[PDB]
């Protein structure tokens, strides 16, 4: 799996692949690796599909109880803290989770919290998660800028996931992109790697070692 | 792996901790602060397992703040360190031990003396003039033994800390991405921009 | 450790050595190993020493309580039952092996108890690392209806065999004699065959030999 | 199949000015049973050398036999010349390291007078690594024996009274009789507190006049 | 031998004023099954030597063949072999100990414990022990297996030190051996009622009392036990 | 161990050996392995001594309470209690038991409870490590409705062979004869049953 | 054919914690099992990337000592060898 | 090994009418020496308790016995005697039979009524080791046993008792890798206690 | 663990290798050179276990020099890489395998073409435009895939190498103490002082 | 064990402690940890005393054959290479070695080669070996200078061993110092840590934490 | 009581190398276990201080397979049950 999320002047760009695998057998190529907690909060699942999907769906219900009780949205810090505490209380029980809690709040701005099985919770501007995280980092750290335009940030996320999909066996499928804006999150669609790769090779001229 | 160092100076306690956060093959962050302000004049730095460090740090901070709120005075660094030790020692025989080593540097406003306590994950408290946890002590202790004095001012303490940190950079294999240095003294807690 | 119990014509005599060892080291040269469960019920144990001590303390307290409750002298079988049930409850994790001997209105009794809760009637018994050496003497010399003197001599000499022939057994011989008609006779260091060899020189140091950095008077 | 045992022997070498002392208990052990009260393990090796391959008894016997063979061959080749202590030490080192990967589980000691006529003690580990020592205990009760001899023979941690710890007690020569007193007392203490020691004390004295054997009783319980 | 399969339990022996006595039961046990009852574990190797062997029975028979071959090879080109330059107990024991140690070092041990008992041609008693590890020692009394614990104390009560050997007569030593064998029968589960006894005397030579019986067993007290506890 | 129970014309004879061992060492050579759980019901202990003694005490408690509340139990009630206790704790327990008793309506009865905790009525039962060596002898020599002396001799010969072949069996052969006349203790010493 | 051990005297006690009571040395805590999807969570599938000096000297294993034995406690063999 | 991880030494001796208890000051993690001020001798009134072993358990037992002895002092109106304190420590150690503290304690004191010197030792789980001459615990238990056996003799007066115990501790510690960095010797009398710090090798 | 990188460019082959040598807790040296000149226009860089690396490197160098002397002409980089692969593959089923990964960067004077061969410790040879061994490939391959072009001159290759090395410094947990860069081309082998 | 060797303007300073330990029992405190291969070549051992002693005596014998045959001194490079090859051929056989081959040759000048069990062989200017190597590095790296005077270099080696002896349980005993000069090596004697420590505390005023 | 397999057809095999021939996977080579004085060389005492994917799903070990079996080879059980 490859997932990345980076803050920039226009908000947050969240990109993830689609492939899910069980050994060598590729189980599916259309796994939705973003759980949509609320119109302003976005989970990014990696590792174990069952654990992430179930516990972030439950986090959605906790968020709903939060608005109903307090009439204001759960902060990104609060949701990430709930998830971190929950995952921590099952440490050693076998949970397999890597989660970036991306959201936007009036009193927080754009914010990303990295959460994983071992209980860690990190606030940060750039995160890559999954088996392909290093390949995504190689591109993000070499191309990331705070003042990227929205189109350039979307393309950077798409390209960073494409690199990991190319180089990592467990990170193929298709690229799903989300843009967490001041007024919510925008789903910028699904891009199949089998076409994105050739489009990017032609336009950039990169992947010069790949025959074609 | 983490670096956490402490030097008790005539007037202040100088705590230094590494900025890197490593998870598996990749460094996730290079600006992490491995410390929590237990009280206005008490500061704690922690090292150990990923979730355990922060979870224990926040649990201890909440308990110390609850005690201070209830009794309406700041707990002495001795009391804070004893509570932390009792929580650590009480955990190793429980189902979920905290694999967390902590250095508690505080200024006792009642005794008007700086205090540095080293507490390992087993719950071994010891008051020290200079402290280090894990492998960070294997390089720094000899240098600290050589150069340390009781009567130093905070600036000589920072020079000694520079010596220790650059020795760690030289000989030690891991890249800990520098340290973040905080001084605990009569006036409270502050951070040094570039010691 | 070396324990022996020996029933004779009018009672039972239990004997043990006194050496106590941690690892290959003699932690104590004069450890008392015979324990009162009651005035006329005595036991000596092997295995995990701390467990033997704790269990004998527990059984003695419970038995004195029960004797006060019933207003009757304790039965040896009462101690046997309580001890074996307690040991069984823990499935041998208490690790207490005992030879329990005593006298009660029903006669003179000699039992052994094992960590897992099994027990045995016997006329002569042995226990501890020196069990085999002592049992050799007991088998060679035991007879029906020993007199008290012959019983004491036999038990003492079996313990001596264990002392001379086993490394984990040494120093002195403790003996306790329970007899039907009268009080038990505890014989601390009945035999002392291992007196200390004399020093060739007195290794006292002239005062001031040690170097002292600081001296203080403590407000206790 | 575990090819090693532990017979619980103890040996002690002390070197003086014109004498060397090698003392060792005669007890033989297997687990908690006493194999024999009198099994000597310090041997008069001839050429004014005394040896004791203490430790696992079978390996001790094998190493001793090998060294006797080697010294006899040395006598054969070198026209019956006297073998020096240092030469014997090197010979035994080569014997021990010849089995580097299947060592003799024995802590060997050889004691004698060196080419200058001064007492010398060479003590060995199962693999070799020989150090010439002024005094060296070995075996089961080495830990009990040795600190007391450091205190008495070397006067470590002893300071002249009235100097407040600035002047050590100077190291005087101990006469052979005094060293025998110390050896007897040390082995008596080891017998008292170690279960594997106390059957009998054998002492071999090496001096310019030749090797001399003395035997003393121990507690034997 | 990585493990023993069929074994003979124990051998007990002691030296007395004029010789040595050695005894061993005739039972070879296959685990807890008292399978073979006619095994002879005392191996005479001359008028002055008897070799008692314990442990694996197959290795015992191999050692017996080794001893027969020793005697046969000694007889070669040795016109004096019958009276002097005959095989002393010391030569037999040294050969056996060397073989045992070589086997141990080769990680293929002979799983036996061997007591070589006899008298040297000068009249001095020989009595030494050797086991699968090559560990050897001498004592006024020797025993193997459960004998080292059950029997050996009883024998030591008779001769506790070298000074007691001249004080010990044939009858005293033989009665001590018989009592020790009776005790071993009482307490050793691997033991048997039948046992062989050999006496080597510096004056009267080797006497070999085969298939003796354990006698004067004490069982009549067993009728007075009615259960555990009550 | 060599346990044995044989029903005969006038009742049942229960027999056992007296040797107990801890490895190769005979820790007790005159032990009594027959236990009186009730007036005319006797059990024999095999397997773990601690487990068998705990089960015996629990069964004695239950059968005493049964006798006080519901009248005298039968052999079947006793063996049923044994069965429930052994089965409900079969993972912890390691006890195999033979239960023999005499009730006038049924005369002598024998139930055997192997290590698994099942219940079986049999005309005769053999248990213990030494039983393996006398399965063939007992099978070819047992007969229905033997006389008391015939049954005693049969048990004597069977346990004699079991003691001969098993190193863990030995000592005196004890038997308890359960009949309308009463209970008779019998003891036979090695020189008596080994010279058969 | 094994011998009978009626008293369980020779009865010997997942791998055992070398030092009972201390969870820090518990096998399931010293070496916890990885998550079922740790291969997808970290690139190489892993969340993560002596005694005796110069002198060759020549503790018991809790898995072959009797149940009642406590490591480091005083223990006397009940029956001997 | 929890008992060997931190090292440390404790030794107690009985004089004619006085007792001495002494310990080393090193605290470390096997190889690394951490602190030279980890005093393992604690006192509760007139009874002194030295504790070797895992340092976390040393501190925990110091707190526990402080609490229990303070409650005893308050509700009894008298200080706990060495015998009663020994029994209390034994009972408290066995309370965790299956989860024991990895410590070896050593009690030393003078019974106030009888005035008789008293010393006792323990294992992990409370086996009382009452002895009349001297008690030893720690990583250098073997060295200390041998040294004290060689040096100790009955009825030592306080000055010679100090010299004997100090020499025993010094020579025992100099031969133990995980012990040293100075030592402290308490000389306890019917009316005073003298604490002294010994000079020794710092390696 | 060692960084060894190689980038084939239009004219030359650029090999980079870490300078740090580590043994357990301490970095023994930080100016180490993990390369050997197999021939005037052929260079080999190696990574792996401590003794195996240098022993295998010198064995290969001696054999290549022996072949060059005997045949009196320089072996092509293809032949050198084939020999190294043959040795490595023959080793893994012997008693003592070489746990050594190697990158052979050479200039084939007969073809006038640079050649870069990546050979893992099992003997898996493959010719590459850019190569990396161990964890060093996980961070750098994506960046090389992004920026690499067949037609680069050596200066652009050095710029790409700087990007790769600084990415490693950023996200790599270890402090590999920088790299030594050597260029293989028509003129021979040379080192870059500060690439 | 602690051993160090550093090159400087006046040659090489080689310092070693003396303690030898079996488990926690200090077997001896006067172990000679420097082997004198030849009047210009010096072997410093750590780890397994038996392996180092035996194989460096064998190295001395090979060195002797070398002078007999070739009429010139075995170079430090050659001696260290022979030792490295030998130790490597026993790699995995259980050898325990750490060695610094210090020497001086006309064509080499002062040279140090670090050799250990794994077959490693490193030329370098400063090396520390043994369980206490880190403390010696801490002292050396903070005080070492190329142009140290001979007295200052000797004192630096002595102090560096003293620090490791203080802080390391397995590195006590006494400090033996050697000075490898242009014309040979000089044995600058043995210093007992039990006295050196107090002398250094009084002269430097360091070790302020140590009571007294 | 076991069932006396005469043909050894039910016969089943240091731990076995999972991939025979390759010494890079031999337990004695993957875990050599150092040397007797490693604790004196290195300050720490040591010279050196999954395939499961995203979706959970429910080869044999040589030690539990007959000696004639080769991992990854075509094998037919001689009798099966």
Swiss-Prot record, chains A, J:
Domain of life: Eukaryota
Designated name of the protein: Proteasome subunit beta type-5
MF (Gene Ontology): endopeptidase activity; threonine-type endopeptidase activity
Recorded family membership: Belongs to the peptidase T1B family.
Catalytic residues, chain numbering: 1
EC number: 3.4.25.1
GO biological process, alphabetically ordered: proteasomal ubiquitin-independent protein catabolic process; proteasome core complex assembly; proteasome-mediated ubiquitin-dependent protein catabolic process
Catalysed transformations (reactions): Cleavage of peptide bonds with very broad specificity
Binding annotation for bortezomib: 49
Further facts: The side chain of Thr-1 acts as a nucleophile, and the N-terminal amino group acts as a proton acceptor.
Keyword Disulfide bond among record annotations: no
Subunit structure: The 26S proteasome consists of a 20S proteasome core and two 19S regulatory subunits. The 20S proteasome core is composed of 28 subunits that are arranged in four stacked rings, resulting in a barrel-shaped structure. The two end rings are each formed by seven alpha subunits, and the two central rings are each formed by seven beta subunits. The catalytic chamber with the active sites is on the inside of the barrel.
Keywords of the record: Cytoplasm, Hydrolase, Nucleus, Protease, Proteasome, Threonine protease, Zymogen
Class of enzymatic activity (EC top level): hydrolase
Source species: Saccharomyces cerevisiae (strain ATCC 204508 / S288c) (Baker's yeast)
Subcellular location: Cytoplasm; Nucleus
One GO CC term on file: proteasome complex
UniProtKB/Swiss-Prot annotation, chain C:
Record has Transcription as a keyword: no
Active site per database record: 1
Highest taxon, organism lineage: Eukaryota
GO MF entries: endopeptidase activity; threonine-type endopeptidase activity
Localization per record: Cytoplasm; Nucleus
Major location (coarse): cytoplasm
Catalytic activity annotation: Cleavage of peptide bonds with very broad specificity
GO biological process, one term: proteasome-mediated ubiquitin-dependent protein catabolic process
Enzyme class: hydrolase
Entry keyword set: Cytoplasm, Hydrolase, Nucleus, Protease, Proteasome, Threonine protease, Zymogen
GO cellular component: cytosol; nucleus; proteasome complex; proteasome core complex, beta-subunit complex; proteasome storage granule
Record has Nucleus as a keyword: yes
Annotated EC: 3.4.25.1
Self-association and partners: The 26S proteasome consists of a 20S proteasome core and two 19S regulatory subunits. The 20S proteasome core is composed of 28 subunits that are arranged in four stacked rings, resulting in a barrel-shaped structure. The two end rings are each formed by seven alpha subunits, and the two central rings are each formed by seven beta subunits. The catalytic chamber with the active sites is on the inside of the barrel.
Miscellaneous comment: The side chain of Thr-1 acts as a nucleophile, and the N-terminal amino group acts as a proton acceptor.
Family: Belongs to the peptidase T1B family.
Name of the protein this chain belongs to: Proteasome subunit beta type-2
UniProtKB/Swiss-Prot annotation, chain D:
Domain of life where this protein originates: Eukaryota
GO CC annotations, alphabetized: cytosol; nucleus; proteasome complex; proteasome core complex, beta-subunit complex
Subcellular location: Cytoplasm; Nucleus
Gene3D superfamilies: Glutamine Phosphoribosylpyrophosphate, subunit 1, domain 1
Keyword annotations: Cytoplasm, Nucleus, Proteasome
GO biological process, one term: proteasomal ubiquitin-independent protein catabolic process
Coiled coil ranges: none
UniProt family annotation: Belongs to the peptidase T1B family.
PANTHER family hit by this protein: METALLOPROTEASE TLDD (PTHR32194), PROTEASOME SUBUNIT BETA TYPE-1 (PTHR32194:SF2)
Assembly and interaction partners: The 26S proteasome consists of a 20S proteasome core and two 19S regulatory subunits. The 20S proteasome core is composed of 28 subunits that are arranged in four stacked rings, resulting in a barrel-shaped structure. The two end rings are each formed by seven alpha subunits, and the two central rings are each formed by seven beta subunits. The catalytic chamber with the active sites is on the inside of the barrel.
Stated name of the protein: Proteasome subunit beta type-6
Species of the source: Saccharomyces cerevisiae (strain ATCC 204508 / S288c) (Baker's yeast)
Gene (name only): PRE7
UniProtKB/Swiss-Prot annotation, chain H:
Keyword check for Signal: no
This protein's GO CC annotations: cytosol; nucleus; proteasome complex; proteasome core complex, beta-subunit complex
Annotated localization: Cytoplasm; Nucleus
Pfam families: Proteasome
Residues recorded as bearing Phosphoserine in the entry: 29
InterPro entries in the record: Ntn_hydrolases_N, Proteasome_beta_3, Proteasome_bsu_CS, Proteasome_sua/b, Proteasome_suB-type
Keywords: Cytoplasm, Isopeptide bond, Nucleus, Phosphoprotein, Proteasome, Ubl conjugation
GO biological process, one term: proteasome-mediated ubiquitin-dependent protein catabolic process
Superkingdom classification of source: Eukaryota
Protein family according to the UniProt entry: Belongs to the peptidase T1B family.
Quaternary state and interactors: The 26S proteasome consists of a 20S proteasome core and two 19S regulatory subunits. The 20S proteasome core is composed of 28 subunits that are arranged in four stacked rings, resulting in a barrel-shaped structure. The two end rings are each formed by seven alpha subunits, and the two central rings are each formed by seven beta subunits. The catalytic chamber with the active sites is on the inside of the barrel.
The name this protein goes by in its record: Proteasome subunit beta type-3
